[PDB]
Amino acid sequence: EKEQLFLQHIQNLPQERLDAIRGHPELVLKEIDEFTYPDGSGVRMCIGDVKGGFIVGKIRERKPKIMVELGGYLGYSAILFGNEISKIPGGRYYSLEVNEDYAKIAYELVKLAGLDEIVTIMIGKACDSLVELQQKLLHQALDMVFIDHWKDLYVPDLRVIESLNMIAPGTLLVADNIITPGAPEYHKYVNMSPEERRGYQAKVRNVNGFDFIGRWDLIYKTETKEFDAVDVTECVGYAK
Ligand SMILES: C[S@@+](CC[C@H](N)C(=O)[O-])C[C@H]1O[C@@H](n2cnc3c(N)ncnc32)[C@H](O)[C@@H]1O
């Protein structure tokens, strides 16, 4: 819709401009940041400079080899963090986006950024794509996960990740918009003890399916970082 206007803008840039920014993630991000729609507004829902910088710091510190984001929109975070993943040998970035129209646009921006060999966009519901990703990785656990899609799916999709044994000691979770609009359920979940999560999981049906009850035997450590806020959750071991 609106998003097609943005894609048209990029595709209609002069060749000299495309040649100038091609293969330069930071420059492609700036073209996204500086675009204005006819009504005067900008591209929405992008992770942005300040939160983005914080997360970039975590990636440089922890050097995740496998990073997954839930919710890609037009490719901004995939480009920002995929660029960081580039610097890490063997590193791969997976973006799980439900809207095919959005994903197609993100695919072009990611390619223009020079990140096509590093970033893979999976189209479909995150819960479905995670099942498929697990099949592809068995050939195991995720190193870092950026959770940035619909707030009501934070805990259901996290429980899917848990159930697929994609969370292990060393795995870091970064969840966006903890305050605005808010994800209180998620914030509650990742601050729960293993025993608390065991009861929650038995009590609260995963809307994604009975088979995705989750894994309570994970020890979590969570810090909220305020800027709005993001929750930073590390699995630090398996629970007794
Ligand atoms: C905040 S935007 C993601 C922004 C992106 N991470 C960035 O910073 O550039 C939320 C996105 O989640 C997507 N979404 C909603 N439900 C989803 C689901 N079940 N699985 C995957 N993506 C979903 C929407 O299509 C939307 O593009």
Residue 105 alpha carbon to ligand 1 centre in Å: 13
Residue 186 alpha carbon to ligand 1 centre in Å: 16
Find the Cα–Cα–Cα–Cα dihedral 221, 152, 129, 143, rounded to 10°. -10
* Domain residue extents for the chain: 1-240
Method used to determine the 3D structure: X-ray
What is the C-alpha to C-alpha distance for residues 82 and 75, in angstroms, rounded to an integer? 10
- List, chain by chain if needed, residues with CB within 6 Å of any ligand 1 atom: 45-47, 69-73, 76-77, 96-99, 102, 125-126, 148-150, 153
Count CA within 13 A, CB hemisphere, residue 67.
36
Q: Best of 74, 84, 94, 98 to mutate for ligand 1, by most ligand atoms within 8 A of CB? A: 98
What is the C-alpha to C-alpha distance for residues 198 and 63, in angstroms, rounded to an integer? 31
Which one-letter amino acid corresponds to residue 96? L
Find the Cα–Cα–Cα–Cα dihedral 140, 101, 159, 89, rounded to 10°. 30
Q: Which protein residue has the closest C-alpha to ligand 1 atom 25?
A: 99
Establish whether 226 is an annotated binding residue. Answer: no
Q: Which protein residue has the closest C-alpha to ligand 1 atom 5?
A: 72
Which one-letter amino acid corresponds to residue 169? P
Residue 239 alpha carbon to ligand 1 centre in Å: 31
Establish whether 157 is an annotated binding residue. Answer: no
Establish whether 69 is an annotated binding residue. Answer: yes
Please report the resolution in angstroms: 2.1
Residue 127 alpha carbon to ligand 1 centre in Å: 13
What is the C-alpha to C-alpha distance for residues 65 and 204, in angstroms, rounded to an integer? 33
Residue 46 alpha carbon to ligand 1 centre in Å: 10
Closest CA to 147 of 164, 123, 170, 130: 130
Which one-letter amino acid corresponds to residue 29? L
Question: CA 185: distance to chain centroid?
Answer: 18
Residues 6+ positions from 172 with CB-CB distance below 8 Å: 58, 62, 64, 143, 144, 145, 232, 233, 234, 235
